[PDB]
Design an enzyme around this catalytic site. Sequence first.
Site, PDB file in Angstrom:
ATOM      1  N   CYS A   1      78.921  91.313 108.338  1.00 48.21           N
ATOM      2  CA  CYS A   1      78.380  91.931 109.548  1.00 48.21           C
ATOM      3  C   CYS A   1      76.902  92.266 109.488  1.00 48.21           C
ATOM      4  O   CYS A   1      76.261  92.243 108.413  1.00 48.21           O
ATOM      5  CB  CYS A   1      79.138  93.146 109.813  1.00 48.21           C
ATOM      6  SG  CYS A   1      78.668  94.258 108.616  1.00 48.21           S
TER       7      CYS A   1
ATOM      8  N   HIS B   1      77.971  85.754 112.786  1.00 44.74           N
ATOM      9  CA  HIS B   1      77.869  86.741 111.699  1.00 44.74           C
ATOM     10  C   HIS B   1      76.444  86.753 111.204  1.00 44.74           C
ATOM     11  O   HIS B   1      75.606  86.038 111.754  1.00 44.74           O
ATOM     12  CB  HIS B   1      78.914  86.488 110.571  1.00 44.74           C
ATOM     13  CG  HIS B   1      78.665  85.283 109.735  1.00 44.74           C
ATOM     14  ND1 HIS B   1      77.787  85.269 108.668  1.00 44.74           N
ATOM     15  CD2 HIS B   1      79.165  84.013 109.822  1.00 44.74           C
ATOM     16  CE1 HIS B   1      77.811  84.071 108.089  1.00 44.74           C
ATOM     17  NE2 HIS B   1      78.642  83.286 108.768  1.00 44.74           N
TER      18      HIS B   1
END
Lengths: 263, 259
Positions: B26, B208
């Site tokens: 993340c 991501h």
Amino acid sequence: VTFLTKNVQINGTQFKILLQNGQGECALIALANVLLISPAHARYAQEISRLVRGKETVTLNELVQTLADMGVQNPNGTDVDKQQLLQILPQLYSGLNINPEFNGSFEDGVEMSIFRLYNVGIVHGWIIDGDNDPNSYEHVSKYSYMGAQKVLVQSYEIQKNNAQFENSEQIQSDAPYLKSFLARSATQLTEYGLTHLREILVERSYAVLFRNDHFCTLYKNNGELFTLVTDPTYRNRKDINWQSLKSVNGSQDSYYTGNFIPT
Amino acid sequence: VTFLTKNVQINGTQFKILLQNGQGECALIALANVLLISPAHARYAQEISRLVRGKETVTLNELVQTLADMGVQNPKQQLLQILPQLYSGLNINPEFNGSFEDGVEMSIFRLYNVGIVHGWIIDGDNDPNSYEHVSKYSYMGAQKVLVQSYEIQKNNAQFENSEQIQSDAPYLKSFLARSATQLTEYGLTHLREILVERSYAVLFRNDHFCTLYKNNGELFTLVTDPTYRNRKDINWQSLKSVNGSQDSYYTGNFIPTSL
């Protein structure tokens, strides 16, 4: 408007296939190519075979549709469909309705019925494996691609602009798992999905594959998967006919001739 | 929610970084790792270094958040509400010209003085027609248009932008099909031209994030995969090719691992 043909040879037999222009192969072209090359469809595909035979390249979308429409009125699944295919078949060129489910099906839609009409299989490997995180599986496996994109736009709008959404609890619950799945399945094919394709496609059979927001003709030879090379870049390379599909990341893959020898 | 830590050595200095868990890297972890390793941030980074130092894995999301929040009170405890938005990155919205749409998450990057970049960039001189349709969109705006196009076909739906929707959609679909891994040839060149030598940034790619660095004119991404936790010699992956076929792993002082 307009498709180049290409002379190819597959397991000894000469064919003409259709090439995509530059922008990504449509489902319509993949369906046409299956019909052009698949021995099991030879009888039913005489008219499309003849359409491309006379054409040192160049067949137009409108010709291809008229053709397929004629073929489909004569389908032999005994579907009573009139030349109403003329309204529908152009939608397969667009492909914007074709909607894979993360459990390995497609949403039922007119295009799926068109694939059934022609007895051409249509498959994908963008599939969440329930033997990985089962929390992810429960959140994601019930979604389609369009369903997911909808949730994700909605989630962004909730944050950005506020929600006017009735199912906002569900959007906010599922959006993180959907985002994570997208991040782990960058090329719209999972390991599990690849093993699924390899299982579900019968030996020496052809199907249309959805992958990366476009379509291709897939074929199973000696238990290994190959996709037909329709890239006009190789229009003049008869020895470049197939790309193997042995790994998700493409690291084990390469081009092959018509007889499944590496190029 | 349990991020493992990893002992690493970057250009001879020992650090501990945070690893991905089951769910892709993340933006929050990528941000944290720039804060952990980047010399320019080292004066600002005491509390985060301290957090991870004796945790042999297991740093939770809540402790990371709390920490970063403490840090952000420094060049307002609404940070606590906002930082967790970095974990899923739902509102981080790359534009296909190389920018991101401005928003709360980008303001968090500016707070910490951490660059954020992407290479999902359409090349205008290569295809001016496509450019005229696509360049103006963000990822979320493209997703919206594609979902609208689906509803137009499936459900005969009516939208206000319909001529525009239906005009742009086939170009957006095309662009997406030709940029599967959210990085283009042109964008790769762009990243390499814009990132300053010895600078860190967070890179968006494939829904991501990761840490990007430039060493001797070449791009590398920090390896945060927990499969390589026990591999101090696997620290970086080169980013020389869109499809990865030219790339390999590198040690923390930029020697090929294979060697």
